[model samples]
Structure formats: structure tokens, C-alpha cells
Target: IRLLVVGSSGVGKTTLCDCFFESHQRISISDIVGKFYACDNPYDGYDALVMYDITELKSFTDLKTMWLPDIFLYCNIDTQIIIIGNKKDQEIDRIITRKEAEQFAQDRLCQFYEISTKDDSCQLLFDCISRDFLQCDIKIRMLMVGDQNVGKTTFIRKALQTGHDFMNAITTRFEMKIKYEIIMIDWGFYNKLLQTNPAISRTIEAILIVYDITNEESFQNIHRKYYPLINNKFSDVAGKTDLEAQRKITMGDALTLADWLGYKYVEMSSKDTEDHSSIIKALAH
Candidate 1:
């Protein structure tokens, strides 16, 4: 991750930046693998961003007024920006409220995280960075196994924000600034294929069973045949709801199979505005 940290000189910017390189307490215990490049000035290509301070209001103000816009001027517009309220351990001396920083994140349209670089919890920032960067060799796999033409291809294409003829048993992969990869395998459904093959269920992390309300056969297929096979062999099983609006808000019955299948969130399509990076992130991790 090419990270850039900018603020007033003593807002823990240097301290926060320093933690990335050294092997500290938690870094030794629960191992994480990733390279971090943090400096006052970097090239225009830095995608990961951090700009905030909790103890100094002046530093915070300057970040908003000058640093944020200043850095954005030189960096990529859709940079993976993070507004960190550093020195959160010093709540007694803190000038910034948690609510204020969180709302500021909403306003700026980026994720906000708070970390205290002084303690064992110091690896919070590292976890955020490393959780995003998968090993270059590793590829995340998600199975999109369901009935033929039950909006299976549409759901993957819409959520992943890519498509071609959309007929293959697998899909194209790309990095969402959160440098990771996913196959999202697209195969036509055969219930026996999953049941007999220990290789299929044993290997994949997530199984997204695509469902459509408009299609009578799709619902019946899942209800009668697939329900018999839908034991908790896989840890996470998901379903598709409304691809019509690519609805962010799901229906009641959307929760019907989703809840029983052990998936909390439903409806994974975003044609217009919603970010799909998190959707794939959810599937991956």
C-alpha cells in the first residue's frame, strides 16, 4: 500500500507512519504480511491515504482546509482515502470527538478509523492495511452456483461492475484499490455436482445462490430441490434478491433464505452508486 500521511508536524503522523516498518508486540504474535511506504511527500500515485489528528485541532483543521484538498489535487481522485483520528488513547486530552470524526468521514465519503500507536492496539492501522492487501500469489474464490439464467450472470456482472458475453463458468478479476483478486466462478446449477464433489464444497469460501422473484422456476428450484442440499456444509451461503433497481434496500423475503443460510446482508448488485468493493470484501474475508 502506497500510504501518504500529512498534517501538522507533531500530530503523531511520524509515529503512526513509523509503526508500519518495525516488528512490535502484536506484529510478532498474530502475523500479517504487507509492505508499507509512508512519507511526508510521495509520488502522485499513492492510493492509500491518511490525514487527521485528535489532540491538535489546528492539525485537524489544516488537514480539512489544506491537506485534504491539497493532497487530492496531486493524487488520484478515487484514492482509497482513510481519515484516521490518531492518538485515540489520549481521550482525556482529546479535542476531537468520536462522533465528529465519524461524521467527517461520512461527509468526505471515506472510511474513518481511530488508533492509538502507543499500545498493543497499535496494530489496528496495520490490520486495516494488511486486511486489504492479499498476497500476490493468492486468489480468493467464491462460487456462484445456481440455476441456469436465473440472473446469475447479471448479479455477478452488476455487483462486480464488469461484463462481456457473460456465458463462462468463471469471471474477470480486478483490483479495487484494495489490491485483491476473486474468480467468482459462474457455473450452471446441478445439485449433485455440489453434493458428490467434496472438492467443490471443501474449497470455496462463499457460495452465492442466486434467486429472482420474477422467475417462478428459480424460487421453486431453491425451495424444493436446493433446500434439501442446503445444509450448513459451507460456512457462508448468500442469495440474490432484487437486481431490478440493484436495490440497496432488501425485501422481507430476501431475508427469508438469507437468514436461514447464515448470510446477514442480501441483494448484491450496484449499477448506479453503491460501492461493490465492500461486497466482494465481505465475500473474501
Candidate 2:
């Protein structure tokens, strides 16, 4: 089975994984993983658990995993989950809230937990995940998605660093993996390019829309521009592409793409990793 880790940059998404495999956290987890990495940790200390960090998912709308985000989610959320959220030690600087995060997870219907790479909260989550993988017979695939720079990469590498060196075992076209099943593909950084894809914008499973938590403009963009644009696209793609120019107004480049994709908003950090399970639960369903 496999699980994917995702979040905005510096959210310790990669560090979460490292903590599990190595049974310890790295202070410089950020420097090593880069954007994407993967590893296989044995469930029950015997069976293989593949995990891919698709942190560098390509910006192209037509390529990569194809239109299979939901399928991947279905396979994954039902099996086991290991989520990481960093920066607890410096709670004052966090822009994303725990309540907002837990509420997001509740809306999606998946088990939720949090961990800080700099703290020890990760042990409990890891233990639970190991148990879940061992008990489940069905193979699962987890899809991690969020805004760019969301520490998605750091979380996965953290998971495998302590295990056997499977680094060279990864394949081309993607950066991280322990086995083919536990592959991680980073969705390149989310940006204006996403606004260009009229189709993908309508159906993005879960978006870790990252912002400089220190910058309010990034947060404002979430509701004023991104969310509304997605709704507009959703309306258009669902055969609501009206015949009016106002319809055209509502269907501008960014608006059309987002509405068509209909992604869940996960406001994340550009400098920290946040564990919001909305993506996993939405995909799992």
C-alpha cells in the first residue's frame, strides 16, 4: 500500500515522513528533500508501505497522473494516513488555524492528526498509521495536493531517511518513491499556469493554495479571486457556459479554469507545513 504527503512549502509535510522512518526528526529537513522524494516503510515491520511525494507535480494540465485524483484518493484514505504540520514551536507566526484545519478535515470525512518536525507529536500519528496499513488488505494510493512551496517535499523524505537506502530505487519522470506504487509526484509549483487550464481548474481535488502567511494579500486572493473563479468555472463546465458576454465576464481565463476544476481551498504557509486533511478526505471519497 502507499500514502502520499502534501502541503505548502515549509509545512513539514516531508519531515512527517522522515520522523516515521528514522524515528527521529532532522533539523535541516528543508535542505535535503527539495520538492519531491519517497520511501517504503514496512507495515507490521514486514509488508512494504510505498509512499510517493508528488510535491513537484507538473504544471501541465494534460499530463501526469491523468484525470485520476479521485481514484488515487479512494485507494489511499481508506487504508492509512500520516499527516505532518510544522512550526508548532513558533505558533505565533502561523497564519493557518488548527480549528480551521480540523473543520476542513471534518467536512471531508477522513481521520485527521497533526505533527511538528521540531516537536514529538508525530510518534502517535505514525504508530496509528503503521497499524492501519497492517490491518487493511486493500491496497491504497494517497494523493497530496496543496499550494506551491508547502513543505510537501520535506515531509516524505523525512519518512524514509532512517530506513534502508531506497533513494536510488526511484524512477525517472518523477523524483520520489520507494516502489512504483508509493510514487510521489510534485505538481510543480501552483501558479498563474493553473489559472490557464480551463479543464483542470474545474476539477482539482484538493488545493493547498499557499500564501506568504505574513502577507494578507495572498489570503485575500483565496476568497475574492480563486474561490469565486472556481465556482464560475464549475458553472460553465457543467453546461452553464452561458451565451452572454457577462457569462464571458464570469468566464475569464482564471475564472474559467478554477470553476471547471472545483478544488478545495487549503490556505497554507509559504514557510511552514500545515496538515489539513481536506485533500486526502476529499480524494478518498
Candidate 3:
């Protein structure tokens, strides 16, 4: 019964989870791992609970437009997604309506609740979540890695059926899908930091090499710079080219490299709605 609690930063996510510390008493808390709060669950497994501020409009907007889709993309069909609306005490300043939140939860087939940690009020939340922690499912860890500003984030958003506004560009920490439990990692390729991570090198299941079709340098970098390093033991070397009209890299050259590297290549566009699951499907293999 592993759960992932995710929402915008400073949305009282940690505050709400802290309530569990006081009420449960015996549970131990570990150092913050990535954007996650690592702790022991009452049922001996793990649960990820994401918290958001009801008073902030962006909190709700980000939840609907960004977080929910990412969650569903990575989570299992039976994963219990508990959407908690923190800061119920600030009802006067609340911008998000209960109906709106409930509707969003219902649409995603997740449970919704609102609570105030100001008064230390979270016993019911714990009670409700604990009972449902008995049933557990296999969850795969996926990461997204590519060149800077490559359409990794854009492709993921489009795949999740969310907004195409690339303006709100935020690099995804990790992304996933159900069924096969694929672990896809997308990050900045030039970063010398990730190359040092033993865990990433050891546990990474597959690598998605993305490049801008309009930018020739991005295409060349993959072969001259990254191919030798990324082409390790992982058999699935998936490639994606962002579909753009003004192109510098020809279709023939792109295909040539795809064939050379033994990588499966697919063209994707953020503006188009057709067959957006190619990358997701490729990673699922």
C-alpha cells in the first residue's frame, strides 16, 4: 500500500503529514528523499499522501493541470490517491471550492478530504487512510532525462492529456504508467551530477533520449556526447524528436541515428492530440 503525497511546494504538505507524527507517536520519519516524505505506515507498508492549500488558486490549478495527470501516469489502477485540502481553518481566504476539488477527485477516481492542521485535526484522515492500507500493489519508479529544454516535460504533459502551454515549463522529477510498471528517467543530460548517482545507474530500467528536431546541435550532442555513456546495459534505448515545422535536423538523418543506435524513434508534437502515447508505450516495453 505505497502512496505518494505530492502537490505544490509550501502547500502545507509537510504540515499535514506532520500531524501523523503527533497522533501516531511511534512512527519514525526519515530524511526527505527527493520530493517525498519517507516514513513508516501503521500497516507496515507505505502510502503517499499529497497535500494542497485550498486558499491558493495556483495550488488547485497546478493540481488539476499538472499533478493529477502525473500521478495517474505513474500510479497503479488500485493505488489509493488521497487528495487532501489543507488549511481548512482559512476558510475565509479559500479560493478553491469543495465541489471543485471533489469533482476533480471524482474525475480521477480518487478520494478527497479537507482538514486543518492548525488545530491538530487529522485523526479521521489517519483512520480513513490506515484502513485502506492493507491492499498493496507493485509500483515502478520511472525517471525522464534529456537535453535542457527538450520536449520531455511537454511530451509528458501532452501524454497526460493536460494543457499544452509550454510556458509553465517545469522539469519532471520522475514519471510512470500502470500495467507494466516502467521506470522512465528524464533529466538534463549535460548535468555531471546524475552521472555520479550510484542508485540511478544501478536501478534505471530504461533511458529516453529526446532532442529538438528544429535544433541540429541537440541531435548531434546525443551521438557525439551521450550515446557512449547512456548506452550501457539497458536494452531499451528509446528516442523521441519534437515535431516542429522549422527543422534543422532532417528526417533521414534522425532515422539514420535511430538505426545506428538500435533505438526506437518516434516523432511527437505538443500542439497535436493524435497518438501521444508513443513514448509511453515505448517505455512500457
Candidate 4:
């Protein structure tokens, strides 16, 4: 089962992917958008996964139609889509609407979900996907999404392991695939894609939204901006919450974004020194 994630930028998409794929290792210096990863579950054949930062799409269009709904349906192939409404940690600067986007996913025939590393639902969401799609005895394909700087790339690095300096954003458009048999995996060359490709965004399975807790604007942008664009793409399941909500927005007001989107709100921090148990617990839900 291939899973795809989508959301605005700076939502920790990359960071979250890193944690999920490589653990807590530092990322290597490389100018790549994303990479293929896997978990060494002895009982499972091969947990094959791929994470992408769809944020690059806006950059490709030079932010021209950044808010347009058409671009949201750019990546849909034989895969499960997960629309994650992320960045609940910062709610004061909210700009997106979960209600609007929820309707969007429903129209798209994909599963929509709003999530943040801040919330304990991270693992819960992952487990849900694993149980539904990943076969215990077969290989499963997974995709993690969100916009550029949304943390799609960062999430891969953190989940798969990091600490090596690799490259920076070379360009905006790119895609790569990897295959794994055990601990060893083969990476596919990154492909540059056009922002107007309807086929690319259509057949999605899951969406992942990433938001910034430290940056209020990034948090608000989810609604103020990214919501409509995504909702117009795929609609199925949606949910979101944030730690930034605590900074200023009334706990209820801040979390209201999740309520509007019908998402389970959560608070999280990626700070290395801080304990991220809250985030892990949310995923387990």
C-alpha cells in the first residue's frame, strides 16, 4: 500500500518523515527532495515507504496558482492517500479551514487526515494505515506528503536516521523511489514533474499536513491558504491540532481549527532535548 501526505509548508513534514523512517539520526547534506525507506520488522516481509514534499509544487508554479485547487490532484496513482492537516502546535496564526478541506477529500475519493507531530495521534494514524494496507507477509508501499519546507523531506530524514550533510533544495520538481530487501535499499533517481499533471495528484491514498509550532504564520497558512487548494484535490478523512495553539490562541480557539476540520487536535515539539512522548502517543491513537 502506497501512502501519500499533503499539507502546507513548514509543518514539519520532512522532520516527521525522518523520525518515522530513520529514527532520530541527523540528516545528511544532499540536494534531494525525498528518499525511500523501510522498517526492519522481522515478521513483516519489507515495509517499503516513500516520502515526498509536495510543497515543491508551488515553487514549480512560482507560487502563481499556489492556492488553486487544481494542483492538489497532481499525485494519484495506485496508492493510498493520507491528507494530514499538520502544525497544530501553533494555532494562533491559523489560516486554513478543516471543514472546507474535509469536504475536498470526500470529493476526491481519498482518505484525509490532519496530523501534527505535536499530537500523540501520530503513531495511531500510522498504525491505522499499517493495519489497513501493509500486509504482514508482503511488501507495502507508503508515501508521505505535504508542501515544500512542510517537513516531508525532514520527516523522512528523522524517521530513517540523519546526521550526515547531503544537499540542499536543488530545484523544485523531483520524485524518487527506492526498494529494500533487508536493511539495504536502492534509491531511484529523482524525476522532475510539472505542477499541472492531473494524473500525478489524482489517485492518492493518504494526506499528511505539516505545520510550524514556532511560526504563527506557517500555522495559520494551513487554513488561511493551503486548505482550499488541498480540499479541491482529495477528500476522505481530515483532522488537525497544534502546540502553537498554546502560544496565544485560546486553547479552545486554537484547537477550533481541528474541530472545524473534524480532526483530533494535538500538541507537539520537535526539540531534540524535549520529550516527544505526547506526539508518539497521538500517532498510536
Best by lDDT: 1
Cα lDDT tens digits, model 2, 1-285, are 233443433244455665656543412111122121233222112221222212222311111234224322333223422223344565654555566454433222234554456557666655665554443332222222233343233333324222322111111121122211222222331232243332332333223222222222234344435424432111112103323444435334322222211122221121111221223233343
Give all TM-scores, in the order shown.
0.43, 0.30, 0.41, 0.31
Q: For candidate 2, which ten residues in a row score worst on lDDT? A: 166-175
In order of listing, the candidates' clash counts read: 0, 51, 19, 120
Better of 3 and 4 by TM-score: 3
Encode model 4's per-residue lDDT on 1-32: one tens digit a residue.
Answer: 33333334544456665546522222221112
For model 3, give the RMSD to the true fold: 12.7
Point to the candidate with the largest TM-score.
1
lDDT of each: 0.47, 0.32, 0.45, 0.32
The segments of candidate 4 whose C-alpha lies over 4 angstroms from its true place after superposition are 1-8, 21-77, 134-285
lDDT of 1 by residue, 6-119 (tens): 566666556664675554441222222122245324454454545566888887777667666554444432345577777767878788778877755644435677778777
C-alpha displacement of 198 in model 2, angstroms? 18
TM-score of 1: 0.43
Q: Which ten-residue region of model 4 has the weakest summed lDDT?
A: 181-190
